[PDB]
Ligand binder design. Sequence first.
Ligand SMILES: C[C@@H](N)[C@]12C[C@H]3C[C@H](C[C@H](C3)C1)C2
Ligand SMILES: [Cl-]
Lengths: 24, 24, 23, 23
Amino acid sequence: SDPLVVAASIIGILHLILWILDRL
Amino acid sequence: SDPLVVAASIIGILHLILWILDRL
Amino acid sequence: DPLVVAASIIGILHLILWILDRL
Amino acid sequence: DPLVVAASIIGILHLILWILDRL
Ligand SMILES: C[C@@H](N)[C@]12C[C@H]3C[C@H](C[C@H](C3)C1)C2
Ligand SMILES: [Cl-]
């Protein structure tokens, strides 16, 4: 319910996805 | 209200900004 | 909240992968 | 939530390491 925590959550998922794609 | 969780949220957003700027 | 919990697990995985990537 | 707290600690470490790796 903290918009900062929910947003950082979504963004942290986004970040790891981008890292894996660049690693593959 | 947990400063640890709030700070890591802020930091995780900054980290993705830095990652994308290195990518761009 | 399962999104926060999911991001938590994912962030832990990310640092492990990044560390191994530089190891 | 100890999981979210653990992942908060790790996320802060992660960026510390990432910046030092670039310096
Ligand atoms: C970005 C990631 N380290 C997160 C971001 C937010 C704060 C912390 C838990 C969860 C949501 C994941 C740490
Ligand atoms: Cl990287």
